[PDB]
């Protein structure tokens, strides 16, 4: 499960939260092994007696998944950045085992883009789309610096919090977001993550449309492996499409670096370019 992260070694133990300090409210979702709940957490942060958090409950007993649980928690406690999901700790007293994360009030970024298409309710403007893209790219610069390969960067795996703050997580193959070498050879690197970031840019600029939406799963695999490129979205300025093309170079060593992609998006976000569809 975490074999590709073997080079990442924790400095310290995970934060432990007493079960009685967690008060479950309602389900936010499920999926990947499995249930996510909104909850109140007591005695976590000094500033607030009680605070909202998101709690993931482990389904398995197992005891293989217990080893995976501990390793996952150890890796998540290392990820400390403004644009990476914030992990608060575990609860190991009793069953099921719990993982506690920061509550991000606006939910996943894919749903957010779809519900704010053509909080402040309404369509997201160019400056806002660039700000979302810049934040994801900032998170990816941090991951590249840690030599951490995400492997499933997609808007469904990002969260939106207070003031449109965006953070990268992984809520649980995402073939449509993968480069040819990942599909064909399961080669996952900083370079395959940058290709997926180019696909995330495409999702942002299409307001959360599915990549290769016109194709079946089989047609998409073949088209990616044969070298076809996603079309420039209507809301996408030329400056932004050039970034996508840089992320999508067939040769991984030719792809633009995430530091340059982030710096370019910062430059555009702090402007933005005078672009009208
Ligand atoms: C969508 C919705 C139901 N939802 C889920 C929320 C979660 O916080 C969450 C739930 N389950 C598992 C995780 N695990 C991870 O993200 C692991 C991880 C992997 C890679 C990186 C990197 N780089 C960082 C972390 C987090 C969440 C919070 N607030 C509101 N809705 C939320």
CA distances from 157 to 5, 124, 141, 268 (A): 19, 19, 17, 24
- Nearest CA owner, ligand 1 atom 16: 169
Ligand 1 cavity residues, CB under 6 Å: 28-29, 36, 54, 56, 76, 79, 84-85, 101, 103-104, 107-108, 143, 150, 159, 168-171
List the end-to-end C-alpha distance of the chain, in Å, as a whole number: 44
* Resolution of the solved structure (Å): 1.5
Q: In what order do the strands lie in the sheet with 87-91?
A: 22-29, 36-42, 50-57, 98-102, 87-91
CATH of domain 1-103: 3.30.200.20
* Rounded Cα–Cα distance for residues 33 and 30 (Å): 8
Give me the residue label for tokens 């700790």: 89
108 is catalytic: no
Q: What experimental approach yielded this model?
A: X-ray
Name the phi and psi angles at 262, rounded to 5: -60, -50
Q: For the chain, where are the alpha helices, taking DSSP H only?
A: 64-76, 109-115, 126-146, 180-185, 190-205, 217-226, 238-247, 258-270
Domain 104-277 adopts which CATH fold? Transferase(Phosphotransferase); domain 1 (1.10.510)
Using the Cα atoms of residue 81, residue 147, residue 2 and residue 7 in order, give the sign of their dihedral: negative
- Nearest CA owner, ligand 1 atom 13: 171
In the annotated binding site for ATP, the residues are 28-36, 56
Domain ranges of the chain: 1-103, 104-277
Give me the residue label for tokens 């007993």: 61
Torsion of CA 37, 43, 46, 49, to 10 degrees: 80
């Amino acid at each position: 499960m975490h074999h590709h992260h073997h080079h990442l070694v924790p400095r310290g133990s995970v934060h432990h939260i007493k079960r009685r300090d967690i008060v479950l409210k309602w389900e936010l979702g499920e999926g990947a092994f499995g249930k996510v709940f909104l909850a109140e957490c007591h005695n976590l942060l000094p500033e607030q007696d009680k605070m909202l958090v998101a709690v993931k409950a482990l389904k398995e007993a197992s005891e293989s998944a217990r080893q995976d649980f501990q390793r996952e928690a150890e890796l998540l406690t290392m990820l400390q950045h403004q644009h990476i999901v914030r992990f608060f700790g575990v609860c190991t007293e009793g069953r099921p085992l719990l993982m506690v994360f920061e509550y991000m009030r606006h939910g996943d970024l894919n749903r957010f883009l779809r519900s704010h298409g053509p909080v402040a309710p309404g369509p997201l403007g160019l400056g806002q789309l660039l700000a979302v893209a810049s934040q994801v790219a900032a998170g990816m610069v941090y991951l590249a610096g840690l030599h951490f390969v995400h492997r499933d960067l997609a808007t469904r795996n990002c969260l939106v919090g207070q003031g449109l703050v965006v953070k990268i997580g992984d809520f649980g193959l995402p073939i449509r977001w993968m480069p040819p070498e990942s599909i064909l050879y399961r080669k996952f690197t900083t370079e395959s993550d940058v290709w997926s970031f180019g696909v995330v840019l495409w999702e942002i600029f299409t307001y959360g449309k599915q990549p290769w939406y016109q194709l079946s799963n089989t047609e998409a695999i073949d088209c990616i492996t044969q070298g076809r490129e996603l079309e420039r979205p209507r809301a996408c300025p030329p400056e932004v499409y050039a970034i996508m093309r840089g992320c999508w170079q067939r040769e991984p060593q030719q792809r633009h670096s995430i530091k340059d992609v982030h710096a370019r998006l910062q430059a555009l976000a702090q402007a933005p370019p005078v672009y009208l569809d």
